[PDB]
Write a protein that binds this ligand. Structure first.
Ligand SMILES: Nc1ncnc2c1ncn2[C@H]1C[C@H](O)[C@@H](COP(=O)(O)OP(=O)(O)OP(=O)(O)O)O1
Ligand SMILES: [Mg+2]
Ligand SMILES: [Mg+2]
Length: 280
C-alpha cells in the first residue's frame, strides 16, 4: 500500500518481472515469489507481478522486493555503491555530478550507503558494466540480464522515472572495447582451486604451488595462466611488481612451466596425469 504510491513503482508495476531477495551471508540471492525457489534472471515464469512479490515477501520472510531487468522493458538500472555517509548524504563527487546530469527516480539501496537510479533510455555501447573508484565507491550500469532490489526509499524526492539521454554515462564509466572459466570450473571440481591465504602462510609459497597446478591445467599457456591467476584468491599487487627485468608473477609462471613436465590435454582429458593433490 505504501510503495505503490510512488510514481516510479507504478511504472515498474506494469511488468510481471518482480522477485524477492534474501541475504545469504553477504549476497542478495533472488527468489521466485510464488514457490520460494531460487529465481533465474532469464526464466520469465520464475518471476511475478508486484502483488505476487509483496505476498511472497511476507510468505517466505524475504528481505525485500526485486525487479528483473529485461531487454524489452525500457528501464536502465544504475547502481552506486558506498556513496552515502552515515547521514545518507552524497560524499562522492562523481556520484554528486552524476545525479545532477541524470535526474530520474533515485532511491537508497538496502545497505543505506548506496543509491539506485532507474532511467528510461539506452546505455552507451562502449562502457563497462562495473567501474570501481579509489575511495571504494563503484558504478554498475545494467539494462538487462540481472535484477535490482527495490526499497522505495525515495532520495531527494526523485520518485519518477524520466526518459533521459544516457550518453553522459561515458564521463563516469570506464571504457571497454578451452575457455578461462571452463578451466577454472574444472580446477574447482578437482580441488585444485586455492583458498585465500590464512595468517601465518607463506603467500609466495602458495603462489608457486598454484602456479604449478596452472601450468598443468592450462597446458603451460603462460598468458592463460596469468589471466586465471588474476581472478584467483592469491592475486595481489606484488604479482605486477618489477623484479630483475621481469615481474614477480612472470617469473613465478615461467618457473612453474619449467618445473612442471606433463600438461592437461583437453582432447585426451588426462585428468589422472596431474602430479599435484587437491587442497584441504
Ligand atoms: N548474488 C547475486 N545474484 C544475483 N543478483 C544479485 C546478487 N547480488 C546482487 N544482485 C543484484 C541486485 C542488486 O540491487 C544489484 C547490485 O548489487 P549490490 O550493490 O551488491 O546490492 P544493492 O544495490 O541491492 O544494495 P547495497 O549496494 O546498499 O548493498 O545486483
Ligand atoms: Mg548497490
Ligand atoms: Mg531494460
Amino acid at each position: 500500500h505504501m510503495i505503490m504510491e510512488i510514481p516510479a513503482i507504478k511504472a515498474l508495476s506494469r511488468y510481471a518481472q518482480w522477485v524477492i531477495w534474501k541475504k545469504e551471508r553477504d549476497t542478495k540471492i533472488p527468489y521466485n515469489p510464488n514457490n520460494g525457489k531460487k529465481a533465474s534472471s532469464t526464466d520469465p515464469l520464475a518471476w511475478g507481478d508486484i502483488d505476487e512479490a509483496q505476498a511472497g515477501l511476507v510468505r517466505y520472510g524475504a528481505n525485500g522486493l526485486g525487479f528483473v531487468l529485461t531487454k524489452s522493458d525500457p528501464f536502465v538500472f544504475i547502481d552506486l555503491d558506498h556513496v552515502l555517509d552515515e547521514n545518507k548524504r552524497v560524499k562522492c563527487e562523481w556520484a554528486r555530478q552524476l545525479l545532477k546530469e541524470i535526474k530520474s527516480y533515485t532511491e537508497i539501496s538496502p545497505s543505506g550507503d548506496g543509491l539506485h537510479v532507474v532511467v528510461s533510455g539506452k546505455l552507451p555501447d562502449y562502457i563497462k558494466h562495473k567501474t570501481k573508484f579509489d575511495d571504494g565507491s563503484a558504478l554498475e550500469v545494467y539494462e538487462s540480464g540481472r535484477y535490482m532490489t527495490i526499497t522505495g526509499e525515495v532520495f531527494d524526492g526523485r520518485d519518477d522515472i524520466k526518459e533521459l539521454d544516457l550518453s553522459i554515462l561515458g564521463e563516469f564509466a570506464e571504457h571497454k572495447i578451452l575457455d578461462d572459466e571452463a578451466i577454472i570450473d574444472l580446477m574447482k571440481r578437482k580441488g585444485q582451486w586455492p583458498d585465500a591465504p590464512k595468517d601465518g602462510d607463506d603467500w609466495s609459497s602458495l603462489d608457486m604451488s598454484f602456479a604449478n597446478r596452472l601450468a598443468f591445467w592450462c597446458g603451460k599457456d603462460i598468458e592463460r595462466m596469468d589471466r586465471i591467476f588474476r581472478q584467483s584468491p592469491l592475486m595481489r599487487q606484488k604479482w605486477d611488481r618489477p623484479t630483475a627485468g621481469s615481474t614477480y608473477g612472470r617469473i613465478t609462471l615461467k618457473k612453474a612451466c619449467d618445473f612442471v613436465d606433463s600438461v592437461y590435454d583437453p582432447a585426451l582429458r588426462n585428468e589422472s596425469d596431474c602430479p599435484f593433490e587437491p587442497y584441504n
